[PDB]
Design a binder for this molecule. Structure first.
Ligand SMILES: CCCCC[C@H](O)/C=C/[C@@H]1[C@@H](C/C=C\CCCC(=O)O)[C@H]2CO[C@@H]1C2
Length: 295
């Protein structure tokens, strides 16, 4: 419309969310992590199959609505960062062409894994350059693009810096709080944060993503209330939903969920090996990073 290439933060988000949703828990976690960290699509089982589908979908190599491998997106991804990656146009074309040969069949995890596997095995190194899948390569993207949220920087802090960039002091100068001012700066910060946390995107509200954050603080029983508060919220701007949550009977639980996601948004690896403890632990962890926490 046309398709927009993914930056280093967008790619890192895809990888970490797919780890969160597909890694097993307990003793088997490390086995899969070691292989996937090495960009090995192994072992050949349904855990890996659906992990692969997750990443292909998130990187938008596979489109679930068309049930199609989107070959022409590969050169777009390449072109957007070619002066940084130095990937070769010849290889990019070959990767594109290999994807054009791929048969998605039913679109199931295994069908996508089976189709993509030889393409992956042939073009793994190139794919890691194009889709910001190396530490060194991603670092070059961040260095060239200071307007991308960095590792170690929370979305709340990144967004604060862009919302209050004039003469007016940040409302969060002594630390972020939940004071509702309705200021244009606060509304901007909250839109930026809601988009960064994937609460909202170009298609609007994701009720399930806000619910996920309550589940992550062990408040699964609040799901119907979370849904009700969002549903009854008049207004469709990020700030409107934020006000609805903050002024509801969910207030403290929302603060805890949102603060935990602040931490997680600063450290995309947080959950990959660590679970929610309590609000005090979250605050201590945030002090180590570039966040909006009170010192
Ligand atoms: C279709 C799936 C192909 C395989 C993808 C692969 O398993 C990607 C793994 C990611 C890897 C990507 C590597 C480097 C990205 C930059 C990391 C950084 O800036 O510290 C590691 C981070 O997130 C997981 C962990």
């Amino acid at each position: 419309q046309p398709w927009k290439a993914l930056d280093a933060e967008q790619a890192l988000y895809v990888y970490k969310r797919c780890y969160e949703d597909h890694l097993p828990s307990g003793s088997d976690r490390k086995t899969y992590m070691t292989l996937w960290n090495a960009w090995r699509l192994e072992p050949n089982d349904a855990i890996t199959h659906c992990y692969a589908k997750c990443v292909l979908t998130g990187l938008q190599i596979y489109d679930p609505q068309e049930n199609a491998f989107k070959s022409d997106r590969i050169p777009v991804q390449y072109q957007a960062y070619k002066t940084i990656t130095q990937s070769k146009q010849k290889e990019v074309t070959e990767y594109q062409k290999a994807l054009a040969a791929a048969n998605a069949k039913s679109g199931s995890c295994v069908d996508l894994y089976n189709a993509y596997l030889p393409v992956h095995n042939r073009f793994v190194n190139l794919s890691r350059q194009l889709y910001h899948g190396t530490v060194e390569g991603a670092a070059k993207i961040y260095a060239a693009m200071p307007e991308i949220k960095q590792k170690g920087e929370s979305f709340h802090a990144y967004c604060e810096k862009r919302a209050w960039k004039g003469n007016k002091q940040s409302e969060w100068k002594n630390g972020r709080r939940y004071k509702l001012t309705g200021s244009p700066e606060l509304k901007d910060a909250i839109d930026c944060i809601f988009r960064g946390l994937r609460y909202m995107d170009d298609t609007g509200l994701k009720v399930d993503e806000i619910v996920r954050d309550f589940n992550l603080i062990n408040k699964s029983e609040l799901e119907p209330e979370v849904r009700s508060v969002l549903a009854s919220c008049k207004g469709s701007e990020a700030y409107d939903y934020y006000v609805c949550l903050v002024n509801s009977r969910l207030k403290q639980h929302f603060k805890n969920a949102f603060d935990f996601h602040e931490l997680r948004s600063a450290d995309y690896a947080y959950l990959l090996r660590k679970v929610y403890e309590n609000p005090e632990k979250v605050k201590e962890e945030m002090k180590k990073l570039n966040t909006t926490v009170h010192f």
